[PDB]
Amino acid sequence: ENLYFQMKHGRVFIIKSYSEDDIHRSIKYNIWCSTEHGNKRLDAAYRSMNGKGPVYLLFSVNGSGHFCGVAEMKSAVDYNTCAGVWSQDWKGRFDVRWIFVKDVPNSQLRHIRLENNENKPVTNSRDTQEVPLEKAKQVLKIIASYK
Ligand SMILES: CNc1ncnc2c(Br)[nH]nc12
């Protein structure tokens, strides 16, 4: 048995990227940026957490068929930073720490559905879709165990 993930503090968000370049840059420099509304949502969650638990980011490139890894949010959002550092010319930056870098096919995860998103498969989420914690524990377990 593995009962590690089944912890009652933590918040988990889907991150969708159109760009494989942005993913590589994120892993290289441990930073990320979302849309304006995505940034606001992540920033609110990080600050309300007050270090009592992690904010996890589950990354997937749009259209790729797989998640590509897991990172923890590690700072609030800085909204006034150098423009143009990502593939398309994004307002701001925050720190992350990449945890897993591995491809996990959507087939491994499509059966987990999100009650807060019309019971759609977690694999059908938009950028910064939040994941209920009890579903997030199931997703993290499948990702950590995929080979
Ligand atoms: C740099 N950040 C991003 N890059 C590419 N696509 C994204 C979406 Br969709 N939301 N944030 C994104």
Short mmCIF file of C-alpha atoms and ligand atoms in Angstrom, two decimals:
data_model
loop_
_atom_site.label_atom_id
_atom_site.label_comp_id
_atom_site.label_asym_id
_atom_site.label_seq_id
_atom_site.Cartn_x
_atom_site.Cartn_y
_atom_site.Cartn_z
CA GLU A 1 0.00 0.00 0.00
CA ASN A 2 0.76 3.70 -0.57
CA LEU A 3 -1.34 5.97 1.67
CA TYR A 4 0.78 9.12 1.31
CA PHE A 5 -1.60 11.23 -0.75
CA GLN A 6 -4.94 10.16 0.78
CA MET A 7 -3.23 15.66 4.05
CA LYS A 8 -6.22 18.01 4.18
CA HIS A 9 -4.46 21.24 3.17
CA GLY A 10 -3.39 22.03 -0.37
CA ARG A 11 -4.95 23.37 -3.56
CA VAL A 12 -4.36 22.01 -7.05
CA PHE A 13 -4.81 23.66 -10.45
CA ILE A 14 -4.62 22.49 -14.04
CA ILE A 15 -2.13 24.51 -16.10
CA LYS A 16 -2.65 24.40 -19.88
CA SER A 17 0.05 25.73 -22.22
CA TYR A 18 -0.11 26.18 -25.98
CA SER A 19 3.71 26.22 -26.12
CA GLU A 20 6.29 23.51 -25.55
CA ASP A 21 8.86 26.34 -25.42
CA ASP A 22 7.10 27.85 -22.39
CA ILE A 23 7.19 24.43 -20.67
CA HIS A 24 10.94 24.08 -21.30
CA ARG A 25 11.57 27.63 -20.06
CA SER A 26 9.54 26.93 -16.92
CA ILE A 27 11.54 23.80 -16.07
CA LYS A 28 14.82 25.62 -16.80
CA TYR A 29 14.20 28.73 -14.69
CA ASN A 30 11.46 27.60 -12.26
CA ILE A 31 9.05 30.39 -13.22
CA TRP A 32 5.61 30.58 -14.81
CA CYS A 33 3.06 33.12 -16.01
CA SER A 34 -0.64 32.65 -16.79
CA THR A 35 -3.29 34.93 -18.26
CA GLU A 36 -4.42 37.94 -16.25
CA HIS A 37 -7.40 36.11 -14.75
CA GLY A 38 -5.37 32.91 -14.30
CA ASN A 39 -2.65 34.84 -12.45
CA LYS A 40 -5.26 36.43 -10.17
CA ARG A 41 -6.79 33.04 -9.34
CA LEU A 42 -3.43 31.42 -8.57
CA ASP A 43 -2.28 34.46 -6.60
CA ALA A 44 -5.40 34.39 -4.42
CA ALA A 45 -4.91 30.68 -3.68
CA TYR A 46 -1.20 31.02 -2.90
CA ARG A 47 -1.71 33.93 -0.51
CA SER A 48 -4.76 32.43 1.25
CA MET A 49 -2.67 29.30 1.87
CA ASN A 50 -0.11 31.21 4.00
CA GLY A 51 2.38 28.36 3.82
CA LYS A 52 -0.06 25.95 5.50
CA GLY A 53 -0.01 23.67 2.45
CA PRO A 54 1.16 23.46 -1.16
CA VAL A 55 -0.42 24.90 -4.27
CA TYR A 56 0.20 22.23 -6.93
CA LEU A 57 0.22 22.85 -10.69
CA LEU A 58 -0.54 19.96 -13.06
CA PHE A 59 0.90 20.89 -16.48
CA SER A 60 -0.36 19.80 -19.91
CA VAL A 61 0.35 21.15 -23.40
CA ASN A 62 -2.89 21.81 -25.30
CA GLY A 63 -3.52 19.05 -27.82
CA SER A 64 -0.62 16.85 -26.69
CA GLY A 65 -2.66 14.00 -25.19
CA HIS A 66 -0.70 13.91 -21.92
CA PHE A 67 0.22 15.77 -18.78
CA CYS A 68 3.90 16.63 -18.71
CA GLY A 69 4.55 17.11 -15.01
CA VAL A 70 3.90 18.74 -11.66
CA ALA A 71 5.21 21.91 -10.03
CA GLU A 72 4.56 23.70 -6.77
CA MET A 73 3.82 27.42 -6.72
CA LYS A 74 6.59 29.13 -4.73
CA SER A 75 5.80 32.88 -4.70
CA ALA A 76 3.00 35.31 -5.15
CA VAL A 77 2.52 36.86 -8.59
CA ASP A 78 4.76 39.78 -9.55
CA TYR A 79 2.61 41.61 -12.08
CA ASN A 80 5.13 44.13 -13.50
CA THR A 81 8.06 42.24 -15.03
CA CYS A 82 9.94 42.11 -18.32
CA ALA A 83 7.48 41.58 -21.15
CA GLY A 84 7.95 39.18 -24.05
CA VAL A 85 9.81 36.37 -22.26
CA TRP A 86 7.24 33.69 -23.21
CA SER A 87 6.31 32.43 -26.70
CA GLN A 88 3.54 34.99 -27.12
CA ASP A 89 3.83 38.51 -25.76
CA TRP A 90 1.75 37.58 -20.78
CA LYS A 91 1.89 40.06 -17.88
CA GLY A 92 3.84 38.93 -14.85
CA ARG A 93 5.83 36.11 -13.32
CA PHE A 94 5.84 33.83 -10.31
CA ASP A 95 8.21 31.20 -8.97
CA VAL A 96 7.52 27.48 -9.18
CA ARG A 97 9.47 24.37 -8.27
CA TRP A 98 9.10 21.51 -10.70
CA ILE A 99 8.39 18.23 -8.88
CA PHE A 100 7.74 15.63 -11.62
CA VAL A 101 8.78 15.90 -15.22
CA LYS A 102 7.18 12.87 -16.90
CA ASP A 103 4.55 12.37 -19.58
CA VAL A 104 1.34 10.82 -18.25
CA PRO A 105 -1.13 9.89 -21.01
CA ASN A 106 -4.64 11.28 -20.70
CA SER A 107 -5.83 7.65 -20.78
CA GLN A 108 -4.37 7.21 -17.28
CA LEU A 109 -6.48 10.09 -15.93
CA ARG A 110 -9.68 10.50 -18.02
CA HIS A 111 -11.79 8.54 -15.51
CA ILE A 112 -11.29 11.15 -12.76
CA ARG A 113 -14.04 13.73 -13.19
CA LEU A 114 -14.37 17.19 -11.61
CA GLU A 115 -17.61 17.80 -9.76
CA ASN A 116 -16.90 21.55 -9.87
CA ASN A 117 -16.64 21.46 -13.71
CA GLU A 118 -19.84 19.65 -14.74
CA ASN A 119 -18.29 16.26 -13.95
CA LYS A 120 -16.06 16.62 -17.02
CA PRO A 121 -12.91 14.46 -17.10
CA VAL A 122 -9.99 16.23 -15.46
CA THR A 123 -8.26 15.75 -18.86
CA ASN A 124 -10.85 18.14 -20.41
CA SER A 125 -9.98 21.11 -18.19
CA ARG A 126 -9.12 24.66 -19.25
CA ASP A 127 -6.14 26.67 -17.99
CA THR A 128 -6.20 27.20 -14.16
CA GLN A 129 -9.18 24.91 -13.63
CA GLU A 130 -9.04 24.15 -9.89
CA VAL A 131 -9.18 20.48 -8.86
CA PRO A 132 -11.11 19.46 -5.70
CA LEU A 133 -8.60 18.11 -3.21
CA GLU A 134 -10.09 14.62 -3.02
CA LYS A 135 -9.83 14.30 -6.83
CA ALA A 136 -6.37 15.89 -6.81
CA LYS A 137 -5.12 13.14 -4.47
CA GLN A 138 -6.25 10.55 -7.03
CA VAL A 139 -4.53 12.40 -9.89
CA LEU A 140 -1.28 12.83 -7.98
CA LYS A 141 -1.25 9.13 -7.08
CA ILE A 142 -1.66 8.06 -10.72
CA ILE A 143 1.05 10.48 -11.90
CA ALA A 144 3.56 9.44 -9.25
CA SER A 145 3.05 5.77 -10.08
CA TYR A 146 3.03 5.88 -13.90
CA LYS A 147 6.00 4.16 -15.56
C1 LIG B 1 3.64 31.51 -20.19
N1 LIG B 1 2.32 30.99 -19.88
C2 LIG B 1 1.52 30.31 -20.88
N2 LIG B 1 2.05 29.86 -22.01
C3 LIG B 1 1.33 29.24 -22.96
N3 LIG B 1 0.03 29.02 -22.81
C4 LIG B 1 -0.56 29.40 -21.64
C5 LIG B 1 -1.90 29.32 -21.15
BR1 LIG B 1 -3.30 28.46 -22.17
N4 LIG B 1 -1.97 29.90 -19.96
N5 LIG B 1 -0.72 30.34 -19.64
C6 LIG B 1 0.15 30.06 -20.64
#
